[PDB]
Write a protein that binds this ligand. Structure first.
Ligand SMILES: NS(=O)(=O)[C@@H]1O[C@H](CO)[C@H](O[C@H]2O[C@H](CO)[C@H](O)[C@H](O)[C@H]2O)[C@H](O)[C@H]1O
Ligand SMILES: [Zn+2]
Length: 257
């Protein structure tokens, strides 16, 4: 099936997933000088106080930290969003080197990695139903650059030896995602899609202006992960990011001047 190499990567996806060339695909380049400040965007509201993490999983494309979304525990509201979006999982996209790895770009700048915190609109009852709606998902995108360590990431970095290969997972309870946020909640927002197949155009993207810093030793451990399953030839999990796609008939709004 699909992945990130020469033969199965982002240039091939359209063959099985023709929406890949669609109206509202992600990621995109964020041109800071074309984005329109919108004084009527409400403040963004991140409520991760009661967040219940369960498990970390290597799915052969990335690793997912999954949350209990059986009630309104950790939710995203405000900003450009209507109603409540429940957190289900976060994951990253990262590079083989520090100059690449993020999906969105800022004035063409690629960051070392990009965090995605994935939320579904509760008005739709479950995740499977929400992916089928234009306002079904809200994903909070946060850029990572390399510098000093993010202490709130270290617990994630430590568990990765135990989920090296596709299909492995470990228990991952009592992890707090507020430790992955920057100080500022300033953001750009546009309507878009999942950046992995099935590339469903159901996402309101909220991309934070301010990056988090991670140590070099922290990203190096991401890069020690494996695309392959146990006992297969080693393909390092690196460069699992889709490049930027045409903006087309869309506007990126900024929460800030
Ligand atoms: N990069 S992304 O956030 O657009 C992309 O979207 C999917 C999530 O909506 C995908 O999901 C993984 O976890 C979800 C949520 O439960 C699904 O169940 C799916 O089967 C699983 O792959 C990607 O992980 C993510 O890259
Ligand atoms: Zn993602």
């Amino acid at each position: 099936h699909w992945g990130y190499g020469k033969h199965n990567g982002p240039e091939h996806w359209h063959k099985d997933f023709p929406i890949a060339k669609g109206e509202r695909q992600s990621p995109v380049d964020i041109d800071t000088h074309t984005a329109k400040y919108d004084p009527s965007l409400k403040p963004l509201s991140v409520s991760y106080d009661q967040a219940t993490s369960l498990r970390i999983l290597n799915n052969g494309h990335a690793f997912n930290v999954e949350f209990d979304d059986s009630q309104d525990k950790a939710v995203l509201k405000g900003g450009p969003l209507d109603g409540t979006y429940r957190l289900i999982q976060f994951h990253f996209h990262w590079g083989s080197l520090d100059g690449q790895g993020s999906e969105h770009t800022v004035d063409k700048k690629k960051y070392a990695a990009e965090l995605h915190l994935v939320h579904w609109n509760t008005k739709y009852g479950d995740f499977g139903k929400a992916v089928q709606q234009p306002d079904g998902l809200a994903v909070l995108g946060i850029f990572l650059k390399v510098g000093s360590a993010k202490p709130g990431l270290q617990k994630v970095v430590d568990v990765l030896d135990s989920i090296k290969t596709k299909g492995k997972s470990a228990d991952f309870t009592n992890f707090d995602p507020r430790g992955l946020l920057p100080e500022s909640l300033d953001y750009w927002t546009y309507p878009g899609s999942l950046t992995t197949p099935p590339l469903l155009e159901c996402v309101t993207w909220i991309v934070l202006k301010e990056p988090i810093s991670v140590s070099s030793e922290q990203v190096l451990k991401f890069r020690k992960l494996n695309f392959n399953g146990e006992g297969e030839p080693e393909e390092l999990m690196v460069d699992n990011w889709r490049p930027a796609q045409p903006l087309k008939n869309r506007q990126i709004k900024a929460s800030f001047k």
